[PDB]
Amino acid sequence: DIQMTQSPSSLSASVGDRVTITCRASQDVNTAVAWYQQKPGKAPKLLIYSASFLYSGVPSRFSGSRSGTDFTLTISSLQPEDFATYYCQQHYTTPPTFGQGTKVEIKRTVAAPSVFIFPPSDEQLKSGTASVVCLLNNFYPREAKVQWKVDNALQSGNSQESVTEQDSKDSTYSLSSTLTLSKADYEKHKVYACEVTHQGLSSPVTKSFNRGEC
Amino acid sequence: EVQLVESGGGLVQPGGSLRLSCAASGFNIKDTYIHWVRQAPGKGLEWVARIYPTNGYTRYADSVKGRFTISADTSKNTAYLQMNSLRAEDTAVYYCSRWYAMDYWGQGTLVTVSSASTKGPSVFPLAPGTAALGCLVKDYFPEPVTVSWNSGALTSGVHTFPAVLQSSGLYSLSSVVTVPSSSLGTQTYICNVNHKPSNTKVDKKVEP
């Protein structure tokens, strides 16, 4: 068994930058190292084989280098298209073993979110459960805080967040925050508020509605 | 073109059996090793097993040795993975690849190990110079779901959030699109939601 220790786990770099990903082998692996690029929810594509050879139809921006047990992938001028998780592999011995991977985030200029608040639909109400949905659209970076203010009080653990992958064209993320409340519990309270803090708003922004009222 | 097509994926009970299958096309599997590689939700690639079809010699990762069986058939130019004694740990996208690294990969097949039975989603509107609107796709199992807008006509400014697994064990996500509000009333807005596992199809028209 040979271990491949890939670093860093995750990295941010700006378009045009020269990004460098390392992977160290636990023993001599001679030349038997490959590099893959996996897009969110697709199969890996082979980039570099026998440690240093560019694979068919991969952009010339990608290069590959070996120094003993240390192996290096170098993307010379990072493009938007190169947003992915990247994995070194060794195939010297059996089993062949994959690094933990490194997620390449595109760093861009800071972008406040557009915030929107969505009261339950009338259709969901008549089923006995209510989902208040808060949208934070097209922001950078990914770090954001969302607190719910139902009847002006904080909420805890009655909220689920989900965030999109970095967009191909504008490199921003969107986020969703969904407060789950019983039909009964919901009807009880008047004000429903979604309060956001992000590096690119001066002060925290709150969007709200008053239950039912247009 | 060289091409590898997986099939046989789907939703199995813990401990159940499921037989994946990898059809090679554009070369002979006599001439190469075939591996299975998988990926758990939001996790790394993990090598599962390999086989040299010519003589059927097989090597396994230790997390599956004795439960999984790899095999091949040169005459059908196809490789197999016989998954037995399945555990929640085995839920993953299973890919098929050949060998001098792994140059061609199949599309992947989703295997989900769970006791939870099939359930179609409920779909609810998110009612709205820019406006935001969308659909709530709630209480379905298993993954995956498909959400289109206006039968695929509308793709600019669309955000279909990854599903969360709720405390119930049922999945939920939200699909939203951003439009000029000048377009409201001029364009009709319909989310198309397809959950093949259930045989569930739903079109919800979203209006203020």
Restricting to B residues 132-161, those with a Cβ less than 8 Å away from any Cβ of A are 132, 134, 136, 138, 159-161
- Please list every residue in chain B whose beta carbon sits closer than 8 Å to the beta carbon of residue A133: 126, 134, 136, 174
- Amino acid at position A202, single letter: S
Distance, in Å, from the CA atom of B49 to the CA atom of B34, rounded to the nearest integer, reads: 8
The whole-angstrom distance between B91's CA and the closest CA on chain A is 15
> Which among B88, B29, B35 has a CA at the least distance from the CA of B60?
B35
The yes-or-no answer to whether A1-108 and A109-211 have a common fold is: yes
Beta-bridged to residue A5, according to DSSP, are A24
- The structure was resolved experimentally with X-ray
Give the contacts of B206 (CB within 8 A, at least 6 positions apart). Answer: B125, B126, B127, B133, B134, B135, B189, B190, B191
By the CB < 8 Å criterion, does A44 face chain B? yes
Cis ω on the peptide bond leading into residue A95 (within 30° of 0)? yes
A-interface mutation test, from B124, B171, B179, most A Cβ less than 10 A away? B124
DSSP three-state, residue B29:
helix
Identity of the residue in A38, A124, A160 whose CB atom sits nearest the CB atom of B124:
A124
Q: Verify whether the Cβ–Cβ distance B44 to A101 is below 8 Å.
A: yes
The whole-angstrom distance between A127's CA and the closest CA on chain B is 10
Identity of the residue in B45, B125, B159 whose CB atom sits nearest the CB atom of A174:
B159
Asked whether the beta carbons of A101 and A6 are under 8 A apart, the reply is: yes
Instruction: Specify the length of chain A in residues.
Output: 214
Tokens at residue A154, please? Answer: 């904080």
- Amino acid at position A76, single letter: S
By the CB < 8 Å criterion, does B125 face chain A? yes
Tokens at residue B26, please? Answer: 């554009």
Tokens at residue A27, please? Answer: 């023993």
- The structural architecture, per CATH, of the domain A109-211 is Sandwich (2.60)
By the CB < 8 Å criterion, does B9 face chain A? no
Asked whether the beta carbons of B25 and A76 are under 8 A apart, the reply is: no
Indicate the fold that domain A1-108 takes in CATH: Immunoglobulin-like (2.60.40)
Q: What are the extents of the domains in chain A?
A: 1-108, 109-211
Domains and CATH numbers, chain B: 1-115 (no CATH), 116-208 (2.60.40.10)
H helices of chain A, where?
122-125, 183-187
Helix then strand then coil, % of chain B, to nearest 5:
5, 55, 40
CA A195 distance to own-chain centroid:
22
Distance, in Å, from the CA atom of B20 to the CA atom of B8, rounded to the nearest integer, reads: 5
